[PDB]
Symmetry: C2
Subunit: 342 residues, 2 copies
């Protein structure tokens, strides 16, 4: 299957999430896009929403944040500061095109999709929190583009309902991501084998949305069959934002890309053919040799035939058939047995 011009069955699709790590600056946003391409990412993912896309402008208990940096402010106000403006989208997509990196966005409402259609995005991203919204999922499926869905909070019934919707809307490019929580979350809670379970149960392509640090999660995801890797990206390590705690800077993201690319090539082939190095080591494989001198007409036995290294003699499969036959030639001790010697 293909995302834009990218074959995800040949290379792992590494996505750098621009997220809110532009810190409200278009200059930092454009600087981050070219650096993600320099880091080795294949696509940049921005978030397209307005506060109306996400929540309600209300003073009620449900809509005020508890305990965070916004310990008593509104959800509408939080999403306002972290929003990626519509005004930047023209420059963001064009800057990604100039740098050669792919670009797509994560919408959060119907209005964001209608705005995104003017860019004709190669793919769509459904965040974990919007996965249980069938009407939103159906609206994105009608776009007939590869859709990546985060399964962080979705139940199996909801994941099954997502599949039926994509089959209903005749959209075959559905990808499911396993989510890993950000530290101090423990490694035991990663459950990276859910990548395999997601592929088997729902017959979709699978990937990893990694909010953890290090190489354990992305490197194992490649081995587990994940073909899309998503990591949050920020240009600077002092660029404080709403996601700077679990994001990667240019150095760590480039290092993660190299770790994932090494895993890809180290996955190699299923074929059990003997490589050039394996054939060089097969010289010292077991083979049948003469463990004593054998005159013509003498019969072969355990006493004059021995399975030894190197492999220049008869293959050890001949041992039972060879035993009891008569030598056709004079065989000195240490001679490699050949066909015709018996």
């Amino acid at each position: 299957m293909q995302i834009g011009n990218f074959n995800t069955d040949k290379k792992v699709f590494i996505i750098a999430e621009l997220s809110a790590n532009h810190a409200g600056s278009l200059e930092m946003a454009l600087k981050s896009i070219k650096a993600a391409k320099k880091a080795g990412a294949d696509a940049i993912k921005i978030q397209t929403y307005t506060p109306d896309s996400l929540t309600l402008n209300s003073d009620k208990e449900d809509f005020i944040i508890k305990g965070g940096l916004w310990d008593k402010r509104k959800l509408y106000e939080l999403y306002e500061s972290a929003k990626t403006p519509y005004e930047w989208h023209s420059q963001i997509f064009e800057t990604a095109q100039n740098e050669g990196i792919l670009c797509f966005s994560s919408p959060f409402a119907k209005e964001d999709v209608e705005f995104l259609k003017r860019f004709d995005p190669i793919a769509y991203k459904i965040a974990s929190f919007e996965a249980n919204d069938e009407n939103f999922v159906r609206l994105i499926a009608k776009e007939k583009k590869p859709t990546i869905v985060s399964t962080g909070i979705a139940t199996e019934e909801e994941l099954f309902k997502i599949c039926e919707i994509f089959k209903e809307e005749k959209n075959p490019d559905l990808i499911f991501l396993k989510c890993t929580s950000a530290y101090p979350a423990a490694i035991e809670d990663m459950n990276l084998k859910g990548i395999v379970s997601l592929k088997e149960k729902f017959n979709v392509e699978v990937g990893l949305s990694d909010h953890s640090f290090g190489f354990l999660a992305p490197v194992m995801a490649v081995a587990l069959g994940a073909r899309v890797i998503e990591k949050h990206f920020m240009l600077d390590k002092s660029i404080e934002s709403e996601d700077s705690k679990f994001s990667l800077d240019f150095d760590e993201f480039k290092a993660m890309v190299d770790a994932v690319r090494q895993a890809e090539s180290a996955l190699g082939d299923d074929k059990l053919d003997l490589d050039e190095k394996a054939l060089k080591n097969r010289v010292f494989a077991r083979s049948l040799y003469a463990s004593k001198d054998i005159k013509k007409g003498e019969i072969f036995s355990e006493e004059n035939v021995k399975s030894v290294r190197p492999s220049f003699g008869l293959h050890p499969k001949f041992y039972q058939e060879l035993l009891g036959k008569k030598a056709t030639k004079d065989i000195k001790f240490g001679d490699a047995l050949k066909q015709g010697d018996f």
Copy 2:
């Protein structure tokens, strides 16, 4: 599957290959066994052979080594110096029990197996070079013990014959290892996907014999389904105590991060579902007003109606006065 007292379906069986890294001194060998437990290995594997077990005492071209440290010497001479003497096995096995680590050996001839039977080994190891010897494989398979086999040089036909032999001799504990060559071997040449193919084609347990440095091969092997990791240990391609301990911790890190296939929501996943989408009143709604896009909005948090009701809810009438920002519930329509 159980190897001795080790249950291989719960934990990855990490084997430290002592090989000839004792340098011909029993004092160094016993120190290596004590370090394997500190590194986190579950078993140490020694080699049981005499030069007769491997090759012939001959000066002919076939039996002289080319290009190594033994650039023109005999194969018989190399195996004589690198041998693990039979006299050491008793102390080696007794040291393994005292340190709490498992111990088994790699035989290379019939005579070596009969010597090992006095120790009742939990498992046997067939080196790659002996994998094409069906008479040797049949002899080891008849021991009815878990047998780990290196597929480094074995052909597909030979691997099938090993399975047929183990099926013939009714020994079901057959394990195949994928081999990775040592430096200068490239990462591209690893072909670690053969771990899965070995499991699929031959219906055996799979493992990794790693001669490479780093964590790429062992950590990926855990993800690929390997339940045996084999590494050479020394107190050129071996690992010291620090490198082996670092690899063991890396392998155990991979195990815990593998987790479950189960897709149930964990405690952390349930905490984040609070911020899932739900149906709320996006305007004030008087009793008897019909619901529409203008007065119903799917938003965060999740305290309102589940978004599945959006199609059914649209067009129905409110049964009560609903204010803006109110979570929609069953009975509001």
